[PDB]
């Protein structure tokens, strides 16, 4: 190639017929995700899914829209992000991907605030930073980096997703730049909102405004204050606050991603690394109240696998990551 490779990603097709148990998990304006199971033809596996649509296929943008976002997560493959199995060419477009049981991390630091402890905290910043390095090798920008779109496919294991807002960097490109749209400007670098600038770096400021919700256990970061003020208070030299539980060591790491000059923030691999450090002492880093007694769900637990799956299904449920195909 004269430009970047080829990307030889597969898209597979997935017949209608192929799933099953259809409930709804969520919907909006512009359309549904549901649960359900596919069952891949005489294979004997049953896959926990989920399956985003648009409500209607009559908006040539929003049509376009999932379509590239589908592009975007066939392309990727890594443990800590997302992966498109496939989709469904019903009368509305249908996006197929595998099933993270317990939802977005947003709100499960909400649900959980009193159970999670300093190891799970850091592990996740770990994770999320592997996912976003992963991306960014791949030359993916994400632009809409926020705890609302890393899902939970376990307490141990989260990883990214959403890639609706995603622009692939061409192969000497350095910035994409936008223009128009809906914008989360509380995830923003100070340049992004300025100027539509995006780059990898911008995503560093959108992971430390992450950490901060996760940190403050899924508070919402400028709270009651106006979007059309963000720029001014950032241009003010101003950031959000030291969480309580966080010592200086992990703060700092917060504020150098909201740093003015983009290449002076953090890389995601050199985040990797920090925080690596951090969660082999993680009680030195955050500072919880009765952190030494905290546990949550894991594979190993009896009714782990029984509270998602029906009984009747789980002789041949496997997980989306071990369906491998060549
Ligand atoms: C975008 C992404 N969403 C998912 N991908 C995978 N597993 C999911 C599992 C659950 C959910 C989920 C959805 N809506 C709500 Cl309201 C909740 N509730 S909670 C627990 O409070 O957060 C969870 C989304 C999922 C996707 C990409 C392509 C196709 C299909 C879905
Ligand atoms: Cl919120």
Not at 284 to 291: A, P
């Amino acid at each position: 190639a004269m430009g970047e490779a080829p990307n030889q990603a597969l898209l597979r097709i997935l017949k209608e017929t192929e799933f099953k148990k259809i409930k709804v998990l969520g919907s909006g304006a512009f359309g549904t995700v549901y649960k359900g199971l596919w069952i891949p033809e005489g294979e004997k596996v049953k896959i926990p899914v989920a399956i985003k649509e648009l409500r209607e296929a009559t908006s040539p943008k929003a049509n376009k829209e999932i379509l590239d976002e589908a592009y975007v997560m066939a392309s990727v493959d890594n443990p800590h992000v997302c992966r498109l199995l496939g989709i469904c060419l019903t009368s509305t477009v249908q996006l197929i991907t595998q099933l993270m049981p317990f939802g977005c991390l947003l709100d499960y630091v909400r649900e959980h605030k009193d159970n999670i402890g300093s190891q799970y905290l850091l592990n996740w910043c770990v994770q999320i930073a592997k996912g976003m390095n992963y991306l960014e090798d791949r030359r993916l920008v994400h632009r809409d980096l926020a705890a609302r779109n890393v899902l939970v496919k376990t307490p141990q294991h989260v990883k990214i997703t959403d890639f609706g807002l995603a622009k692939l960097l061409g192969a000497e490109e350095k910035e994409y730049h936008a223009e128009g749209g809906k914008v989360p400007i509380k995830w923003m670098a100070l340049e992004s909102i300025l100027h539509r600038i995006y780059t990898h770096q911008s995503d560093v400021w959108s992971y430390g405004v992450t950490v901060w919700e996760l940190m403050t256990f899924g508070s919402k970061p400028y709270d009651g204050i106006p979007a059309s003020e963000i720029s001014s208070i950032l241009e003010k030299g101003e950031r959000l606050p030291q969480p309580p539980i966080c010592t200086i060591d992990v703060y700092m790491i917060m504020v150098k991603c909201w740093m003015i000059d983009a290449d002076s923030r953090p890389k995601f691999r050199e985040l990797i690394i920090e925080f690596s450090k951090m969660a082999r002492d993680p009680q030195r880093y955050l500072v919880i109240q009765g952190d030494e007694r905290m546990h949550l769900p894991s594979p190993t637990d009896s009714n782990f696998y029984r509270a998602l799956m029906d009984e009747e299904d789980m002789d041949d449920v496997v997980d989306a990551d071990e369906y491998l195909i060549p």
